[PDB]
Amino acid sequence: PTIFEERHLKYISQLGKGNFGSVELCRYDPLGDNTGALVAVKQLGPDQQRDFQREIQILKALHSDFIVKYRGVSYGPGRQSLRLVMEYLPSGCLRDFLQRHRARLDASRLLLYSSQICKGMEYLGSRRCVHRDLAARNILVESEAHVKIADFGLAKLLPLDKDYYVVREPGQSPIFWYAPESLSDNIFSRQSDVWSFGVVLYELFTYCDKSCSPSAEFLRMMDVPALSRLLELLEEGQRLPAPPACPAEVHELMKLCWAPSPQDRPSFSALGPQLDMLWS
Length: 280
Ligand SMILES: *CCC(=O)Nc1cccc(-c2ncnc3[nH]ccc23)c1
Fold this sequence. Notes:
This is Tyrosine-protein kinase JAK3. The active site is at residue 133. Belongs to the protein kinase superfamily. Tyr protein kinase family. JAK subfamily. ATP binds at residues 15-23, 42. It is found in: Endomembrane system; Cytoplasm. This protein is an alpha+beta fold. It folds into 2 domains: 1-88, 2-Layer Sandwich (Phosphorylase Kinase, domain 1), CATH 3.30.200.20; 89-280, Transferase(Phosphotransferase) domain 1 (Transferase(Phosphotransferase), domain 1), CATH 1.10.510.10. The protein has helices at 46-60, 94-100, 107-126, 180-185, 190-204, 214-221, 226-236, 248-257, 268-277; strands at 9-18, 21-28, 37-43, 70-74, 83-87, 129-130, 139-143, 146-149, 156-157, 164-166, 187-189. The strands form 4 sheets. Strands 1-2-3-5-4 form a 5-stranded antiparallel β-sheet, covered by helices on one side.
């Protein structure tokens, strides 16, 4: 079941490109008659090949309604799985779903999305997994009221005696989703995933509008390099403003996810009942 034959994997479209690899829309068509199920296939480098096998084993060990379903692999020279096969969600990434259907998604609908992302993250933390690229662009839409965490290319497992990990090479994702410890020291933990969540929370309560986006807004508040400016601003006490018509209660939780000390930050298991008291 988990061994999908590449010959039966028929190319449809490019789903995306991010963090060295690419995701393609394929049809797993063993009958060769265009009736088979659609699946999302990821493919990629020496440390890149160790990082693909890392992504595969992590996702394969993840079993949640709020994490993209792993379907299996399409093997190659090894021991070395040529490609990773995931479930396909035709609604796609939450960022463009938000933009496409905003006139229809209200506060209640956004809190349910928040609480679902939250339980997914609480689960990932339980597996000792730190996502490191939690953004609305990396959240998928299963149905109108069901979202899932995706893109585990930069995900890492935490050692049993360690609750944080330091990355050698700099960040390549948009800088605005990182915590001040990730920016200044490349330190990552479930606490740096919590900072990122409050940014996802900001994203939901803007419907990912490009004009007031995390990138567009720092651009206004900001010779000094653009990374050191955000470091300067965040350490001083500056934060993204309350999104247009955002409830005062949702915004306060955003600023707590944005506590400057990472130990002070609320956990995901702590975030959930608070998002669940605001209903849906
Ligand atoms: C909306 C922009 C974006 O990031 N789209 C994106 C990139 C890569 C893959 C997907 C994708 N779409 C649908 N089902 C998927 N399953 C796994 C990954 C999927 C979307």
